[PDB]
Structures are given as C-alpha cells and as structure tokens.
Write an enzyme that holds these catalytic residues in place. Sequence first.
Site: not given
Length: 611
Positions: A53, A56, A202
């Site tokens: 993404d 990360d 997230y």
Amino acid sequence: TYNYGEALQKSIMFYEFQRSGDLPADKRDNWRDDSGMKDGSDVGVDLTGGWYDAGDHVKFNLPMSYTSAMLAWSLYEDKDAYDKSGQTKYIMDGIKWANDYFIKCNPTPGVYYYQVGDGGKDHSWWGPAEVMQMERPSFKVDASKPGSAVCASTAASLASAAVVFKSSDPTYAEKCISHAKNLFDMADKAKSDAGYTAASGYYSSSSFYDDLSWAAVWLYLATNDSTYLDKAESYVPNWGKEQQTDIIAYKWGQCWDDVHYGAELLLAKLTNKQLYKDSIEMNLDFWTTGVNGTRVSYTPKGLAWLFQWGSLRHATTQAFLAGVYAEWEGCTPSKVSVYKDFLKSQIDYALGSTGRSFVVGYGVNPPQHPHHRTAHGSWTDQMTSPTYHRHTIYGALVGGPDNADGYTDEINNYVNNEIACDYNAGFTGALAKMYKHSGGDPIPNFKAIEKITNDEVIIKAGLNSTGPNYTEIKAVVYNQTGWPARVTDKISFKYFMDLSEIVAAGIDPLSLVTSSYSEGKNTKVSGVLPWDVSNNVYYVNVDLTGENIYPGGQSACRREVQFRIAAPQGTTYWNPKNDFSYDGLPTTSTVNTVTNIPVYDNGVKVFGNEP
Ligand SMILES: [Ca+2]
Ligand SMILES: [Ca+2]
Ligand SMILES: [Mg+2]
Ligand SMILES: [Mg+2]
Ligand SMILES: [Mg+2]
C-alpha cells in the site's frame, strides 16, 4: 515549464517499486525482488502479487483497487497520451499486476480475500519487504461477513481493466469481467461493510453506495449490459449528501473512500442527465471558483488544500477529474478554461511551481526522505539508520504541505512525507493530460538500476584474546544487503596465517588447535587448513551457512564469531605478525571493518582480499 512525459513515466514506475510477489524477469530495477512469497499460505490460496500500500507491506485491497481503477480510467481517457509517450506497456503492466492479484483473491464464487498482512505486526518492523519475518495473515469477506465497498471497488478495478485490455487481450478482459461480476454481486446483495474489519484504523470504509455506483458504471462500460447502468443510477439517492441539504456531497474529492465523484462524472458523460452534470460541476466549482459562497482552501502558493493528510493526493486527483470533465462536450463552456487552468496549476505545484518538486526522483530538489521501508533500506530495523535512503523510489508523490505551504522532508513525517498507491493514482491521469497538452519527453529506455552504494556484506574484527602461543579473533559479519535486500545463508570467511615458524619448529601446521563464543547456532570453525603451503599459508574457515542472516534488525543482520588458533602450551615461536589476516587487526575486542579476512557468499569472495 515542466517535463510532463518524464513525470508520467516515473509516476507509472512508482508502482513497480510497490510490487509484492514473484517479480518479472523483465524487471527494470535491481533493488526489488521476490517478497510476500507465502501470501495466502495460511488459507491455502495463492494470494501473492498486488502492490504494497504505502511505505508498509500490507496489501489493503480497498486503496489498491481504487488505484488500479483510476489508472485504467486514465488509460481509457487518454490512450493517445500513453501511446505517444511510449508508456502504454508500463501502465498496462501495472494495471494487470494489481488485477491479476484481485483475481487470485476471488478463488471461488462468493469468496473475496481483501487483505494480506496485519497492520499492527507489519508496521512494528522497519525493513525491506524481501526479508519480512512476521506472519502475514489473509482476511476475507463472504455472504456472512460482507465488504460491499472493497468488493465493489475491486469489481470497478477489474471492469475498468477489462475495458482497456479488451482490444489487445480480449481473453483477459473476459477473465476480469467474470470476477468483477462476482464481486459486484457480492457487494450489491450485501450492501454492508460489516465484515470488512481487518483494515480498521487504516482503511475503514465510511461508504459503499458510491463504490456500488462506481463499480456498476465500469461493469456497464465493460459488458454493455444496461442492467448495470440502471443499478449505478439507483444508488445515487443513497450517496452522502451535504449536511442539512438534499444535495449530493460536493465538498470533498475523489479518493479511495469516496468514489461518487468519479461515478457521477462518468454518469454525466454516459447519460447527459443534468443531475450528474450539476453534481460534478458543483464539486469542480467548489475546488476552483467556489460555489454558493463556499470554496476549498487554497494555500498562498496556489495549492487547493482539502485536508492535512495527502493534500497533493487530493489536489492532483481533482486535477484529473477537472481535466476529464473539461474535455467533455457537455461541460459548461465557460468553465472549460477554469477547469483546465486548475489541472495545470495543481499539477505544476506538485512538479515544481514552488521551486521544488514533490515527486521523488523528479525535478528540482525532490523529496529525499519519503516514509517508505524498502526504499530507505534499513538493515537494523531503524527508521533513523542509514541517515539517507538507499534507493530512489522514482515517481512517488509525497503527502504534501500544510495549508500555509509548509513542508518538512523527513522520514518520520507522515503528513508531509508518506507515499502511497492512492496518492499517485489520480496524479498519473492528470499527468497524462498535461503531457498530451504540453509535452515533455520521457527519458528513453529508463531503468532504475542503481549503483551499489555500500558494501553489501562486510566483516569487522579485533584481537579478542592473545598469548605467546596463540591468537584469538573476534569477528562480526554484517548483512547490509540492499540490491536487493536478502537473506545471506551461505556466508563464510577465512582467516589466513603464515605458519612458516611452525614448520621451522618441526611441528605439523595442521596439528595446531583451533577453538570457538559465537552468535548463530550453526557457526562452524574449522581446524587449520592448507591454502598455499609453498608460501606457508594456511587458514581457518568459518562457515555460517544455514544462518538466517538478514537486513532486518541489529541482531538479525550480524553474526559474531570468536575463534582461536594455538601452538603448543609453553612454546614461544608463534608469530602472528607474518599472518596476512593479522595485519592491521584492531588490538582489542572492539571490532572494526577489516579487508584481510575475506568474506564469501556461496564460495564467491565478496568482501576483502586474499593473500
Ligand atoms: Ca466508499
Ligand atoms: Ca605466523
Ligand atoms: Mg521469479
Ligand atoms: Mg537529508
Ligand atoms: Mg609469508
């Protein structure tokens, strides 16, 4: 002005650096390699592939599919720009990379894996994707635990991919449509995000009717089945409204969590209905001239600033929509120039209108410290070390400045300096439009084959213990690999001695006693072995084969080995001074890099010198 073609080329390339899985042999970089290779193993499904993404290594399918759908939308709108710039192959390869993964995530009708990786676990480690050691769980939605937004967002990606691949690869277009239909069916029947929970904190979803319309529009363009166009319009009353009005929301922008902007723009073009034209123009007007006395904030230097997080992501995405809409015959004529001026101003701000570029590896004074684990390339699980990024993640658009144009290029500055798939999605489409209009040639045959800037495997040594009949060495091997970061499980090193004084004493050099503390359970220190006996050169072989040495922590990247070579007790002829590996050796147990105790990787010398 700015080189839009080069910008476009690098923005597309950005995604190649985000790739997870078994990378192509045709890869044009030398710092990314296979990673996330066991993705889906926990559920017995091959879920390898897709894009990480942001900085990360979690694969979050909502932003990931939003991204590929936006790239496909750009290719649909501006194929001529891609063909002319010579970037068509690259953006199509990107679109297929993401979609091949979504296909794998829909292994059987009614089942959709929407995430691989745990945010908590993934984010707790700072290191290169290639050597991740933590568990990477897979998560899925189905009829019992629905994920309408992520399923529909994925259906939109698949359907839009089908539209742009139909001409060159009709079979793949059909494959995409098949899966898009299944995921849309899941989403539409469920009308709920209740089972979409693994991305909490997230990418939690705040809406799915927008995704349903967006997906339905793309399924209509892919299949030409008006059943989908009717569905697309049917969800409009369910879209979020401006507070205390019956007016479709217009004060935000197209993004991974809200795609009604793109859906209504497309619906206006497809149906020419006033409702959609009014809605998209209200949004675009709010972003430019303002509307009904309301207007998005603008920074002093001209950035349309929506929110503190990913301000450039928002401005450049809106730039893309403004460009697409401005080109449509149905756009209010007087606004065409307003919208096109907005596309240029926002893109130019990202590229360099303030005096510096906000695109990694592009233009003047580009960001040097994006928040990104693999590009940084720490081998010690430290965001602060090295103090510079070992790799240039070309094309990445950073989050952006605050509302006063303030920006700090630091690795730990998320607001200003995070980089992510969705940040570059709309940006890419806006760049294609600027290239079409103003040009700027891409760099021919551009590749990211970097020079190796630090010795990848080194050894430090020092004199641990000593005596009239012996020498004891403390040696520490360090894995500092980065091209690509990798496990080094076949490392060994050799300590060379001149044993002429042993031969002279009437003693067999092979009879000397070698002995060995040492990190690593597999550390093996050999007895004295011959190397070049004609010059009385013998050595000790230290093998670390089997050790899981990897660039992901202070202990993980190193293996310490202490070893001693000794002549008979009571003797005094042992002479370390004529030993090749003793020359310059640091006099204490505080080790330093040495170049005379060569390190081998699978038998090949990679660091240091031999006698
Ligand atoms: Ca949504
Ligand atoms: Ca000697
Ligand atoms: Mg391979
Ligand atoms: Mg610096
Ligand atoms: Mg000699």
